[PDB]
Design a protein around this ligand. Sequence first.
Ligand SMILES: OC[C@H]1O[C@H](O[C@H]2[C@@H](O)[C@H](O)[C@@H](CO)O[C@@H]2O)[C@@H](O)[C@@H](O)[C@@H]1O
Ligand SMILES: [Ca+2]
Length: 472
Amino acid sequence: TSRDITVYPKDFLTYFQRNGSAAGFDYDLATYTQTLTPNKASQAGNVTLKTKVDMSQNFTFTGKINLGDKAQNAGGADGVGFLFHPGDTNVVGAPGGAAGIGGVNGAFGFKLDTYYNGVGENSFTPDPSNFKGKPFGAFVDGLNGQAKTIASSAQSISEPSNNNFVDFTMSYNGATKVMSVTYGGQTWTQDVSSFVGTNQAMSFSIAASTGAFMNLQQLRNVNFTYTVAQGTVIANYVDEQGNTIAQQETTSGDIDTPYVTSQKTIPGYTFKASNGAATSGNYAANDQTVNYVYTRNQGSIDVTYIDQTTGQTLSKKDLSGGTGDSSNYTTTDTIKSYTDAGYELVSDNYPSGGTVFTDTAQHYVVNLKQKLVVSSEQKQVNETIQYVYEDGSKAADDYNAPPLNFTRSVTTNQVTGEKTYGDWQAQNGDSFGEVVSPTIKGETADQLKIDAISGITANSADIQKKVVYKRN
Ligand SMILES: OC[C@H]1O[C@H](O[C@H]2[C@@H](O)[C@H](O)[C@@H](CO)O[C@@H]2O)[C@@H](O)[C@@H](O)[C@@H]1O
Ligand SMILES: [Ca+2]
């Protein structure tokens, strides 16, 4: 790769960032020395690596470490921790009995512990009992956040004395996944594959701390040859309420190397914004996340209710919902409403099996007409001639003349009330005939005939007449 580099003492600070105590002390380019903690109490200072490390590839770390001038008995603490973890390049471990390895998740390393911590805190498990008051060099399991010393790797080291620099070496094999540490003639080896696991990129921190006891702790002549791990970009395709709606898109590539992310076209959904990182840019050591946020596509359906008679809209219902969901609408209720007020349904193009919201808008029409009930009107004009004597007794049988019937058509508007009365039509005619009055022997009728009466109209009043017979 192009990522095989070699950090010289000359360019230490170019790849390493002094943090905590260490920030108050210049890198003396004469001696090639970085103070981590001074001889003061309660200190905490480290160097973090600017990049991460390819744990599929081989690295070698060469330097000298001063652990200080005092042993634990003389008031000397706490040691130098070497931390490897998968998260942030700027995350470092807890001081004290945590050695700069505890209190980080997925953490592992090698410590130089110049103080015996017998007491258990959340950040760290007691130090190996077989090293009470004695200084030791060991591997640490920091994965569950709690730094646990691997008692199998715990050997003794020379007590810090006269601020002397002892030669340190940490080597790693990519495929073996095997760490080889060498501090002044003592040698360690561990297979870290149970720690490195899937993560082939781990951030590198070299920490130092003091407490109630203290010690000047410093690094000199640093030579790190490693393969710099490549940066990641994550792209997440999510709805407005965070739910993932398309498979995310992890992508790795060298640092300061362009990255490009894709606006996905997602059925049912429309791109709103990209929160988080840019959609494009350059790859970096800590990993950047761009989230594409989608709005759930909403469909239209209108159902216009028209009065054909007036050619005027009674009601328009607007429906809106997500593309795929049911409107749960039926015309029947709104139809009924109008049919109660005396409308008649002519047409309904709205599906009886209900609708569903679609990306294309839907338009439906229900046509009603003002109902018209065709009544029949009837009227009869009748003529009666009574034939009586002068005592009012019946002389002859009443003449009921063939009645003149009349028929109209009424049309009642079941909405407005308006009645549309037709043309008064004579079924039998307009003429009431002349009626020659019966001849009674030995009498004379006052009217010997009733004269024919024409122009009878539908509202003409019934003709009533009386023929009186006088004796002789
Ligand atoms: O006094 C504050 C101090 O607390 C911590 O140290 C304790 C322990 O973890 C140390 O090993 C010993 C000797 O150094 O002293 C304490 O008992 C650490 O949190 C330290 O950095 C802090 O300043
Ligand atoms: Ca300790």
